[PDB]
Every structure is written in structure tokens, then in C-alpha cells.
């Protein structure tokens, strides 16, 4: 039943082919799960080298060949634009249950069955999380359990090591950008640096921002403190036409005549600048001044700002103006003819950052920025690569926790107590089927893939920690305490993740147990394989 | 590169159900069951196998071509055992058994199919086969009475020659009929003692003629001459025939008996010697009352002289089945020696001569009042070796058949021409459709299996299937104006070859089949259906 | 690290061959399992072909080329030696038992901790098999329950028709011999006989024996009522002169008178036998005389005999005659002399029958014979194998219940049940450790096979069988009464085997267990293979 010069896969060749990618790629992200993972080199034929272990930069920046595996990746990867994490976790439970659903249809078990077993057990486990999460305290105080979340974030993408420095810049980030009121949070006033000066541990935390342009004059100032921030709009350097011109002179007095045409503005706008420096901080003491000037500046400026004691800044970003406008409460003058005193605004310790290749100019310190910054160092393309995005994925856990309160301890206490959880229920209940406890079983065994995963990584014997683990389940269960049960990665026994300080994400876990039982039900139900159009 | 897997008992030719060795095996029967289709019926279309020998056999007997194709595939030694099954228990049926298994293998291969196991095709075909033995005794007409009347064997020896050179059974018939009569002792009010004996007619054959010229003689008849004087027995009742087997020369001692020749006068009186001891050997012979002489050695010329002297009949039968033949004819026993042929050892012949057929000398033990024998001796003549050979295989079937009308139901006759077939075939789907379960296809494919007779028989007619099948099928799916089915329910398939179209009613020819050759051949082809149905896997091995 | 002429396995790849191995053999036996099974087709290459079932004579007969499957034949077939029956149950628990074991290889466990824990399951197995068990009474009337084990035995060697046939003889046949009492069981006292050119269907049994040899005289009685047995091993073959003599005559008439006159020593002694025959109820009513004659008989004697309405045989075996002096209690006469009443025995009807190539007698109907004989009949080789095979089988099945009245029922009752109660009781107890509980959890599956494999023969689903089963087991616990629940293969549901009539031998299960538990741990063990000798 072919037609000339087709291609097509009939019998059970289909659920080989799916579960074939399926252990492929489960084998692949396997070694990324939990702090103790491997990291992973990826050349995008550009020849150049990047480490990382988030699973969606794995995903998407890998060749993947079998179709399977490409939807697989693309589901898992889906995950990002709703949680931001749990990829792997998705792989891992698709992984195992595909192949614990290949094992019982070796049984003669019809994939209808099996998904119609998963969607009772995804029930199940929904009921089960909802009555296994912890209400986190909305009290702003409370900064060591934002550390313990920072910290369970981070270790998975770093080397456990630069943990001590960037735990608590994100987590002091994250906790100053949420201003104190119910609002809302918002990761975008978090500004992201990448410098390739210094090691990676010599990262600091930044209270305001960066500017990149400046002047440049060696009397120019270093430190300025208790500066009023000034921003101008309108050019103070000498300007050509578009097309190539000069002046050219034979004498001093033609030099003096045509040099006037060029310095006639910007003398004009210093004189009003200048005379309001004066104004404001002009004899003040323990007070400096700092002008933006978005638009450029020419030497002669600069030196006259030099000499004024002013730190004089050129060419601006835009954005960095707003930033400012945001942070500094200045405002920006479109004109000199209309500066007046109250564009002022008000900063506090500004100084400039010298560096082999650049310069930076620090407006740190304001009274209410409203904003925070995160300088990045390294020495290599990928090591920054890899800070980026494990501050990234910090900075979007902690926020994600303070919107919601909801937390589920981690250390793999939730997956063995779920699979627990889901087999004393089922099997005491009995209230699906006789059959759909196959599917039932599956799901169970699958939802301990990512305890197993954890404990193969570190190098301990799954079959001896999560037996000690189920036993302390055991235990607690029979007693009338309440008692969260989990495994020990650096030690590898038994510890409670709540006293460690181990937590996993609420809608991480859920939207990753979700997303696996629908790719498992959709791949499950191929039977045949099609190709047309070509 | 490419590695085999998939075995593990030794390197060998394996067949599994897993790669449909179900349908392997039933391809397989099927390469000698489309042979076997083509010989049932009246039209049957002769075979030719080439044997060893440098003989050129044809035959239409689907049995002896078995025993002489070569046949390797185990399953079909099946088949192959069940035809011989046939042929020994059974005087007839050896193309039927043979039909009916592939027909019934054919249908399980629809049965599996639809996805029904091998277990529940055979517990099916099991009930079908004792519903349809059940009902076979329903489908009885007539029945032969056992009187060995020739007209009344007639109807059972007709059916049984035909298939075989068609168009001849009116003097087949008649010689069959003839000899059975001839062999058939008188007898009545008894049914425990079996009267038919096979082994008491012989089949001859002599070249040129046709068979018109055949004839039926009354006792055994042997191709032997008498190779001396006396040619032939006076007219005298009862004579005196003595069996010998040392040869009629000179008699010897047990103890010594060793003569040692040196001297001329010694050699020429040792000669004379050897012509008195065989005068004196024939004159012993004679003052017994022998009249008759059988020889199963050689004779020497002075022996001939000295019998024929005596006026004794010799008669040479180096055979030793003809000679038992001749002593069961006459009751005689050989005598291991000579002169000695004690009266007790003595049989009675009435006459005893050469008659001449077509040129060949031949000489026949026979008797009409007296000492009666129950042997009676089939004479065909034609001039084509290959139709003496088809009519002589049709005379032994058709005088093997008669063992089939002893005491056990032996004379039960059914319809003919695949009516009985078509009866069979409505009751085996009433039946499947009253029995619930998935039983009921199996039921209805073994319904199905018994429509091969018309199939077989339109078309070695050169007729078309279609046409034929359907108008059987109405004539006997029809409602009669009552709870019991009456009138005309015997309408098979015509031979054609004239009127216009359509069946007729077996009655104008007589056609029946017996009872149990049909419950006989259903029943093996079941048994060998099942053999076959209930492996999944054979091992083969180069041969 | 290897030598010329000779092959390893490394690693694991001496397991995988010998699971690979194991599964494919317990293919080859999975489906001849079972009433529902189907038979297997041998060729010698001879022209022989071999249509069996039972597992003993397949592995003996069939060549094996993978040496593992070879060894596991091997060991199974000691099941032949010790209970004569479960060698497909011995092959296919080992097959299971592997798989298993390998799948949780596969996941780490050392071999040796699976093979601990079939130990252990293998002691928990045999305390539920000293449990579970039927205690069989002593009463003579029990022949409703040996016809009931018969047709269970027979029932999984013939087609379900012969079994109407062969269960009665096998029944009469064992009990005749061990009478109801102590004394003891011998198979021995059972002749199997094979008669060609019959009915499969024709089997019979006879109380007595049956004698090869039979009359050759037309004027025999063909049944004699009431006959007295004389046993001669007299010869009465013509008889020369004592001393030196011959025959050298001029005519044969001279050696007639010599011979006849030589007959005087053969005619004497037929004259004392003719006398004893007058003498022992020569013309009381309802009384005959039949002679054995082991030696050779003169055809003038044999007519003597008939005359006198005097059946008697020739040319007998001497087997025969030690069987006939037990069989019809006469004595064999060394001497016609000495010939006296006390020689004659006494046996009922003596009847010979006629066949076309051989004619038997019968010498049954016997006051005490202590034995018995089965007469297979059948028209094809293959065929009176088959029905030999099963008397043989349900012969010992007979015996064994006879001799050990311990019986379980059948009918997957016990293996179901076992498998529960190994699943309850090893995890309620954990006596060894948790590590132990893998290799629990597989045998206890391993054990599941039988049922689901004769469920799977049948044609129905064995999932829906299995799960009704477990739900009438369930419900039967849960009313705290004792029933047994087994798998009726003809209508698909659950049935009670103590009401069918599937029952099971106490030994041939325990042997199995113990065998496959044995096997299972030894393959399981093996660490590598090596190769000498080349």
C-alpha cells in the first residue's frame, strides 16, 4: 500500500524512530541537570568557542537532524517565554516516560491507554503539588531566603566558586529594584555590563549607571561628590557642512577672524553654562557639578570645563539619557538660552573608570535611582557568555519568586514525594482502571528521572540515596511532624531542603510537568510517518 | 558487514510465524493442490511423470502421482499421508481428501486474515466437521442392498469409473460388473461374514485391438505357455493338478546323491541313468493321479517328452505370485521335491488350456460346475499403451470400490454431481450463523471450502465458473410451500456439452457418491487441515 | 589482552548474549505453552518429520547452536528425570528472570545483588508454596479426581478429542496396577503398545497383555471362554533320530516313511498334551484350553491342536512368556514328561484378531495379572507418537498424584497468587535490605509470566485477564475468605480451578521454581566468556 516513489514508515518503525530521538536527547541533556552537571562546548561554524548548561541555549544553538528531536527541543524551549527554566527537566520527564511508554507497549499496552493514564496521573500530581507547596513570607526583611534562592538559581550555571560573589549582587538587585509598594516588578531598569578587562570574580554591584562617552583632559576630574547633573541637548564642538570645507587663513588676523565664525555658539553656551555652575555649587563646599551634554564637544570646551572644575561628558546615549532623566531627576535643556537652575539634578559620588581600551564615567548614588546595574568581567568571550546568562536566569528566578509566594523545596524531595504520592493514591483509590494503572506506574516511575539524573551527576548510586530518601519518606509519614525529605548532593546522604536552603520555582515545575505529559500524549499517539511536499 | 541474527539453533532453512510461515506452509501445499484441482471431475485432465526407469506413466490418480513426485516440503507429506490414508482405507477419494485440505487451508488464510488465531480456526473447523458428519446421514437417496446383482452394482461401479477415459464406461461398467458378479459367492440373511475380495480379480492387458474387444473370463488366467505336446486338459471333470518347485529334472538324495564321471563308459551310463530316473520321476508322478503339472523352475526337454507321454498338462509359472495365485485358485500346495506329489497336496481344476488373444498364447485355470472358485480374470486389448494403462487403472478402482458395500453402512448412496456438496455447504452456514462467537467465521469458511466440487467440475468442462456456480446455487436455495424441502433437491452439475444451459437432475444418470467415502475423506482432510493449521514453526534443513 | 584461536566477551557483553539467548529459546518454547499452544514441526533430513509439544523431547531432539541456550536446555531437562513435566515452565521463568535481571542491570544493579534477592524470593516461594497447597485424600473412590488430572495433563498434549479417550485408560491403567494401599507405584506393570492401519481414535485399554504372535490354523476357535494357559518350552517341530542317521533313498517314498516314522517323538508328546487338555475340563461347560508353546510348532501339530478345539500359538518371546507367567499364573513346562494340571493357569476370553500385515491375541481378562497394557492405535507415524507421548505423560502425571498426595490447583491460579504474596511480604518484611527489593521486584514479575503467556496463547488480552484476576483476589481478601482464582482459557474471564478441574503437581512446581531460580542466578553470574582448546 505505497505509491510510486514515496516514503513513508508503517508498523511500529514510527515508535522506534520517536523513541530512539527521544533517549537521544535525554542522554544528551542528561549531564546538565543539577549543580554537579557538565558543561557543554557549541560552535556555531564561526569557530569560536562557548560554554554554557542552560538547556535552552543547548536547544536552539544545537543541529538537530531527527524531527522528533526538533519538536522535542522547540516544546522544551517554548518553556522559556513562560517560566524561564525547567528545559532540561522537560527533556528528562519526556525522555523516561516515552521509554517507560515504549517498555509497557512492548506489554501490548495501546497508547491510548498509556494517555489517557498520564492525564489522570498529571491530575494527580496537580493535586499533589498544590497541597505540597509552601506560602513564602511577602515580608521585604526577609533577605536570606532571596540568598538561598539566588544561591539554588545560580549553582546549577556556575562552578560553585563565583557563587559567593554573584549571589548577593543579584539577589541585592533584585530586592532594590521592587520599590516598596505592591506594584509590580520589572527586570528591565536592571542594566547588564560585559567588561574584558578583569576575571570574572572581581564582579561588583552597581547602584546606578554607566555612560561610555566622556571627555577627555588630563586636569579633567576623577572623583565628584554631591554633583548636580545637568543635560543639554544642543551641540558645543565646532561644525562643517556636509560637504568638505574649511578655513583657511594667511594671517593671524584672517586665523582670528574665521576661528570666530567656528567659536561664536559655543562661547555663547558656555558663557550661560558657566554663569550658572556659578549659580549653583559655585562657591558651596563639599558639592560638585557634572554636565551630560548628549550632543559632542570640542577641546576648547572641555578644557574650559576642565579648568572650572567640571566633569564634562559628550556624545550620550539616548537611552542613558532617559536612564538618567529616571535616576538623576534631571532634566534636558534644548537650548542654552532658556538654562535655568531647576534642570539641575542631583547625584552622588561621580567618577571615571579607566581602562586600556575605554573609559567609564559612574553616576552612582542617587537618592532614589529606581534602577540598578550589574557589571559583568571576564576574560574570554564564553566565560562572559556564561555570567550573562547565569545572572540573567538569577535575576528572573528571584523575580519570579517575589511575584509569587509560592515556593516547592527542592533537593529532589518534590519528585520522590510526588512518585510516592502518585502510587499510594492510585493504587489505593483505584478509580481510573485496571489498565490505566499501567500508564499510572509509568508516569510515577518517569516523574523519578530527575532525582536519578541528579544523583548519577554528582557521582553517588541512585539505588543507595534515594532508597535512604524513600526510607526517611517513610519515616516522616508514619510520624505525626510535618518533614520535607531530600538528597544530599555534596554529601550524599539524606537532608531536609528547607533547612539547607534548597528551593525549586512553583510554575517551574508545574508548566514543566505539564509541558512533558503533552509531548509525551502527542508523540505516543504517532503511528506512521509521512513524507510529501517534494 | 550485514550480520544474521534472529537464530539460535543451528544454520538451517527456518520458517516462522513471525515472517508468516502460516501462509508458507499453505503456499506450499497449494503448488500440488493447483495440480490436484485440475484431476477431480469427469473432464479431468491427464498428468505425465517420467520415471527412473525411462517410463513415460500418465494418470489422472492424484495418489499416484504423490507416490512419485518428488516432495520435500514436511507440511505437504501431509497431504501426502492423508491421500494414502485414503487409498488404503478407502476404495475411493484420493483427489477429494486432497481438495477439500487445500480448500480448508486456502480459506484459513482468509480466516487469519482477519486477525483470527490459529487455536479458535481449528476449534471451528473441529464443530464444523462433526456438524457436517452429523448431517451426512441426511443426505442419503438410496441404498444398495448388498444382493451382487450386476445391475444394482452397476450404480456403485458406474460413479467410480468415470473420471477416468470418460465416454467408456458401457463396457467398463460391464466388465467390472461382470467380474464382481463372477467372484461374489452366494450368500444371504448374513452380514458378519465379508464376502468381497479384491485380491481375487487380476487385470490383464494384450496389445493391439480396442476395447471393444475386451472380455471377462471366469477363473485366472496366466501369459504362460505350456511350451510342450499336450497344449490343453480333456473335457474330464475334476482333474488333478500338482505344484512343483525343485525343477522337473532328475531326482536327487537328500543325503549324498553326488555322482563323480571318469571313465567314458561312466559318462555314457550316467546318461542313461538321467533318462531313467526322469521316466521313472514321471511315471511316479502319474501313479499319483497327476493329470495337471505346475513348474515354478525350469523343465528339461526330456522331461517335457516323458510328461507328455503320460498324457499330463505342464504349465510354467516361474512367478511365485502367480504360483500362489494358482494354488489358491486350485488349493494345491507346492512340492519342495519330486515324486512325491502326495493326493493331499493335490488340487482340482475342471479345465485347463491355451486360448489365443490378439496373438499372445495364454493359459487359463478355470472350472464351471465343480470346485468353484471365487477368481475371476479381467482381458483388456487396445492398441495404445497409455489407454490399456488408464483402463486398467480405471478396473482396479473401480473393483477396489466394491470392498466399500460391506455391512457398515456400505451401500448408502448421496447425490452426485455436487448437489450433496451444495446441501452441505447451506447446512454448515445455518449452522456458523446459529453459533455464536467468532466460531461462526471459521464455520462459514468451512462452508465455503466445500464450493471447490462445482468449481472443479465447470471448470475441467470447459465451463465458466461463474455462470455455472450461481444457477446451482439458486436451483438449490429455494422455499418450498411447506416447513420440509421436497421436490427436485438433486441438481448438480451437468457434463454440458449440449441442451442449452443450467443443471439437471442426477436421476437421468444415476451419479452417487457413498456414504463412507465421503465421511471418510471429510474427516481426514480436517484432520490434515488441522496438522497443518497447528504449526507455527518448522525446521528445514538442504537436501 | 587475547590469544590466537579463541573469542571473549568483555564488559557486558557476555550478559547481553546470554539474555539474547535465553529470550529466543523462551520464544522458540513460548508457544507450545498451554492447552491453547501449538506444536513444532522437526525434520531429520532422513524423511522422518516429528509433529511434538512436550518441551523435554523439543530440546532433546532439536539441535541448539548458541551455547547458553544449550546450557539452559541442559539444566531444564533435569525436570524429565525428577517430576517428568515443566520444562517449558523451567524454560520460560529463566527467560523472564533474565529479562528482568537485565533490565535492572541496565540501571546499575550488580548482578550479585538480583541474584540475593531470588534467593530470597525463591525461600519466600517455597514457604507459600508449603501454604498453599491441597492436602488429597486417601479414599479408593477418588477416580473422579484422578479422571480430572488425567484430562488435565492430556488435555495440553492432544487435540481435545483424544482426551475423551485417553483419559479413562490412563486412569484404569494406573489405578489397576497400585492397588489402594500402601505397597507401591510402578510404570512398569504399563505395556504401550503401537498398532498401524487404524483410527487415532481406536485407542483402547486391556486389562491383560497382548501377545504378538498368533494362530496359524483356519479350524481355531477365535474366542475361547474360560481357557487354562499351558506354557511349553518343549519344542514340537519335526524331530529327527536321536542318533547318527539320514535319508539316502532312490525315491521319495522311502524318505516319507522316515520322516513319518521319525514323527513318533513329536506325536508322543502331543498325545500327553492332548491328554492334560482332556483331562483339565475337557468337556466341562464354559471352559477351553489354550497353549503358549514358546518354541515352534510343526504344521501337523498345529492341526492336531485345532481338531481338538485347542488354540494354540508358536514362535514366541521369551519377555513374553515371564510376562504370562505373572499375567495368567501358569508355569513353563521344561519337560512333556513331567507335564502335569498344577502347569495350567486360567485367564478369561482369548480372542485373536486378524490384520492385514500381523495377527495379535489377547490374553487379558486375568483373575490377577498385576499389570496392564495400552494399545495405541493410529494411521500415521506421527500420529502414534503424539498418543504415546501423552499416555506416557499422563501416566506419570497419575503416578506422581498418586504417590504425593500434596496438589494445587491450576489453571495460573498459583503463580498469580504467588506473585501477590511475594509483593506483599518482602516489601512488609525488607529482612535483607532495601538494595534486595529490585531483585524481589523481578522475580516476583518474572514468576507473572505463565499466565500471561498462556493468556497470550489463548488469543485473549492478557492485560484484561490478569486484571480480573487481581479484582477477584482483591474482593476475596477484602471478605477474609480462602478461594483460589485461575484463568479460563475457552470463555476469558476468571474461573475457580478447584471447580473445573485444573490441578498441578506439588513437585513439579516446586522443581521448577528451584530450577529456574538456579538456572537464572548462574547466567546472571557470568562475568565473561572465554575460549580454550582450539
Same mark, same amino acid.
Given at each position: ?6 516514503? #513513508? ?11 530512539? #530521538? ?7 541533556? +542528561? ?29 536552539? +544553538? ?110 541585592? /538587585? ?131 570645563? /576642565? ?8 556624545? /550620550? ?39 586600556? +581600551? +575605554? ?39 528571584? /523575580? ?120 509525551? #500524549? ?13 | ?543
Amino acid at each position: 500500500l505505497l505509491n510510486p516513489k514515496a516514503e #513513508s514508515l508503517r508498523r511500529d518503525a514510527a515508535l522506534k524512530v520517536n523513541v530512539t #530521538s527521544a533517549e537521544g536527547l535525554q542522554s544528551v541533556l +542528561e549531564t546538565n541537570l543539577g549543580p554537579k552537571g557538565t558543561l557543554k562546548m557549541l560552535v556555531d561554524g564561526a569557530g569560536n568557542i562557548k560554554l554554557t548548561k542552560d538547556g535552552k541555549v543547548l536547544l536552539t +544553538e544545537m543541529q538537530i537532524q531527527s524531527p522528533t528531536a526538533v519538536l522535542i527541543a522547540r516544546a522544551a524551549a517554548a518553556q522559556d517565554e513562560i517560566t524561564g527554566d525547567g528545559t532540561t527537566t522537560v527533556v528528562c520527564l519526556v525522555g523516561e516516560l516515552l521509554r517507560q511508554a515504549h517498555r509497557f507497549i512492548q506489554e501490548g499496552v495501546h497508547p491510548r491507554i498509556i494517555t489517557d493514564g498520564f492525564e489522570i496521573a498529571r491530575k494527580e500530581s496537580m493535586k499533589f503539588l498544590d497541597e505540597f507547596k509552601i506560602s513564602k513570607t511577602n515580608l521585604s526583611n526577609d533577605r536570606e531566603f532571596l540568598l538561598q534562592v539566588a544561591r539554588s538559581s545560580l549553582l546549577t550555571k556556575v562552578d560553585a566558586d563565583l557563587t559567593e560573589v554573584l549571589t548577593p549582587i543579584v539577589t541585592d /538587585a533584585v530586592l532594590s529594584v521592587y520599590d516598596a509598594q505592591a506594584d509590580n516588578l520589572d527586570l528591565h531598569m536592571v542594566e547588564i555590563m560585559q567588561m574584558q578587562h578583569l576575571s570574572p570574580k572581581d564582579t561588583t554591584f552597581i547602584k546606578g549607571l554607566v555612560l561610555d562617552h566622556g571627555g577627555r583632559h588630563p586636569d579633567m576630574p576623577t572623583r565628584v561628590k554631591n554633583a548636580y547633573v545637568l543635560i543639554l541637548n544642543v551641540s558645543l564642538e565646532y561644525e562643517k557642512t556636509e560637504v568638505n570645507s574649511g578655513f583657511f587663513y594667511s594671517s593671524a588676523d584672517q586665523r582670528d577672524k574665521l576661528a570666530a565664525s567656528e567659536r561664536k555658539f559655543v562661547d555663547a553656551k558656555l558663557k550661560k553654562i558657566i554663569d550658572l555652575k556659578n549659580e549653583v555649587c559655585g562657591m558651596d563646599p563639599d558639592k560638585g557639578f557634572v554636565i551630560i551634554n548628549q550632543k559632542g564637544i570640542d577641546p576648547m570646551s572641555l578644557d574650559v570645563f /576642565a579648568k572650572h572644575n567640571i566633569l564634562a561628558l559628550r556624545r /550620550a546615549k539616548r537611552r542613558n539619557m532617559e536612564r538618567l532623566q529616571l535616576v538623576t531627576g534631571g532634566e534636558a535643556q534644548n537650548s542654552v538660552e532658556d538654562l535655568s537652575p531647576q534642570i539641575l539634578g542631583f547625584s552622588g559620588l561621580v567618577y571615571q573608570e579607566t581602562i586600556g +581600551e +575605554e573609559k567609564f564615567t559612574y553616576v552612582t548614588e542617587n537618592t532614589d535611582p529606581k534602577s540598578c546595574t550589574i557589571l559583568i568581567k571576564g576574560s574570554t568571550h564564553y566565560a562572559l557568555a556564561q555570567t550573562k546568562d547565569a545572572v540573567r536566569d538569577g535575576l528572573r528566578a528571584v /523575580a519570579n519568586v517575589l511575584k509569587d509566594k509560592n515556593i516547592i523545596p527542592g533537593a529532589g524531595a518534590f519528585y520522590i514525594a510526588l512518585s510516592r504520592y502518585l502510587r499510594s493514591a492510585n493504587m489505593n483509590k483505584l478509580g481510573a482502571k485496571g489498565k490505566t494503572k499501567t500508564g499510572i506506574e509509568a508516569f510515577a516511575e518517569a516523574l523519578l528521572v530527575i532525582p536519578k539524573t541528579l544523583v548519577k551527576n554528582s557521582g553517588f548510586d541512585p539505588l543507595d540515596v534515594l532508597a535512604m530518601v524513600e526510607d526517611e519518606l517513610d519515616d516522616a509519614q508514619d510520624s505525626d511532624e510535618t518533614r520535607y525529605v531530600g538528597v544530599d548532593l555534596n554529601i550524599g546522604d539524606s537532608c531536609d531542603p528547607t533547612i539547607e536552603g534548597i528551593w525549586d520555582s512553583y510554575r517551574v515545575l508545574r508548566n514543566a510537568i505539564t509541558g512533558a505529559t503533552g509531548i509525551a #500524549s502527542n508523540l505516543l499517539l504517532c503511528d506512521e510517518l509521512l513524507r510529501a511536499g517534494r | 558487514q550485514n550480520p544474521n541474527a534472529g537464530l539460535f539453533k543451528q544454520g538451517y532453512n527456518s520458517y516462522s510465524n513471525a515472517d508468516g510461515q502460516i501462509i508458507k506452509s499453505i503456499a506450499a501445499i497449494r503448488e500440488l493442490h493447483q495440480m490436484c484441482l485440475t484431476s477431480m471431475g469427469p473432464c479431468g485432465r491427464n498428468k505425465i511423470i517420467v520415471n527412473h526407469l525411462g517410463k513415460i506413466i500418465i494418470t489422472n490418480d492424484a495418489a499416484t502421482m504423490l507416490r512419485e513426485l518428488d516432495i520435500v516440503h514436511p507440511a505437504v507429506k501431509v497431504l501426502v499421508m492423508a491421500t494414502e490414508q485414503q487409498k488404503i482405507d478407502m476404495g475411493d477419494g484420493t483427489n477429494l481428501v486432497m481438495i477439500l485440505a487445500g480448500e480448508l487451508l486456502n480459506v484459513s488464510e482468509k480466516l487469519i486474515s482477519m486477525g483470527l488465531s490459529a487455536v479458535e480456526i481449528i476449534q471451528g473447523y473441529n464443530m464444523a466437521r462433526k456438524f457436517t458428519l452429523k448431517e451426512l446421514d441426511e443426505m442419503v437417496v438410496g441404498e444398495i442392498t448388498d444382493k451382487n446383482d450386476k445391475n444394482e452394482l452397476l450404480k456403485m461401479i458406474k460413479p467410480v469409473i468415470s473420471s477416468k477415459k470418460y465416454g467408456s464406461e458401457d463396457i467398463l461398467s460391464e466388465l467390472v460388473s461382470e467380474a464382481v458378479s463372477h467372484v461374489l459367492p452366494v450368500a444371504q440373511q448374513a452380514g458378519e461374514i465379508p464376502y468381497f475380495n479384491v485380491d481375487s480379480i487380476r487385470v490383464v492387458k494384450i496389445m493391439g485391438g480396442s476395447l471393444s474387444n475386451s472380455t471377462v473370463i471366469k477363473g485366472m488366467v496366466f501369459n504362460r505357455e505350456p511350451e510342450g505336446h499336450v497344449k490343453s486338459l480333456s473335457e474330464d471333470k475334476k482333474h488333478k493338478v500338482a505344484v512343483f518347485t525343485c525343477p522337473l529334472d532328475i531326482a536327487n538324495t537328500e543325503t549324498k546323491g553326488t555322482v563323480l564321471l571318469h571313465n567314458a563308459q561312466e559318462m555314457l551310463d550316467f546318461s542313461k541313468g538321467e533318462e531313467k530316473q526322469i521316466d521313472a520321476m514321471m511315471k511316479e508322478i502319474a501313479d499319483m493321479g497327476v493329470e495337471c503339472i505346475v513348474a515354478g523352475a525350469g523343465v528339461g526337454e526330456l522331461a517335457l517328452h516323458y510328461l507328455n507321454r503320460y498324457g499330463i498338462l505342464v504349465l510354467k509359472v516361474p512367478s511365485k505370485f502367480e504360483l500362489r495365485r494358482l494354488c489358491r485358485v486350485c488349493g494345491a500346495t507346492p512340492l519342495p521335491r519330486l515324486g512325491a506329489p502326495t493326493p493331499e497336496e493335490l488340487g482340482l481344476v475342471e479345465t485347463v488350456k491355451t486360448m489365443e488373444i490378439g496373438g499372445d498364447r495364454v493359459t487359463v485355470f478355470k472350472q464351471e460346475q465343480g470346485e468353484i472358485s471365487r477368481t475371476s480374470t479381467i482381458i483388456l486389448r487396445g492398441a495404445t499403451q497409455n489407454n490399456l494403462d488408464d483402463i486398467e487403472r480405471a478396473i482396479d478402482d473401480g473393483v477396489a470400490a466394491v470392498k466399500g458395500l460391506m455391512k457398515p453402512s456400505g451401500g448408502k448412496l448421496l447425490p452426485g454431481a455436487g448437489a450433496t456438496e451444495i446441501e452441505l455447504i447451506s447446512r454448515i452456514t445455518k449452522y456458523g450463523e446459529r453459533t455464536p462467537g467468532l466460531l461462526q467465521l471459521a464455520i462459514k469458511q468451512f462452508a465455503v471450502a466445500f464450493e471447490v466440487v462445482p468449481r472443479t467440475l465447470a471448470e475441467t468442462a470447459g465451463l465458466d465458473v461463474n455462470e455455472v456456480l450461481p444457477n446451482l446455487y439458486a436451483a438449490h436455495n429455494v422455499t418450498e410451500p411447506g416447513a420440509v424441502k421436497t421436490d427436485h433437491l438433486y441438481k448438480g452439475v451437468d457434463i454440458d456439452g449440449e441442451s442449452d444451459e443450467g443443471v439437471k437432475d442426477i436421476r437421468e444418470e444415476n451419479i452417487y457418491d457413498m456414504l463412507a467415502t465421503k465421511k471418510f475423506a471429510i474427516n481426514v482432510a480436517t484432520e490434515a487441515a488441522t496438522t497443518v493449521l497447528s504449526i507455527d514453526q518448522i525446521i528445514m534443513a538442504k537436501k
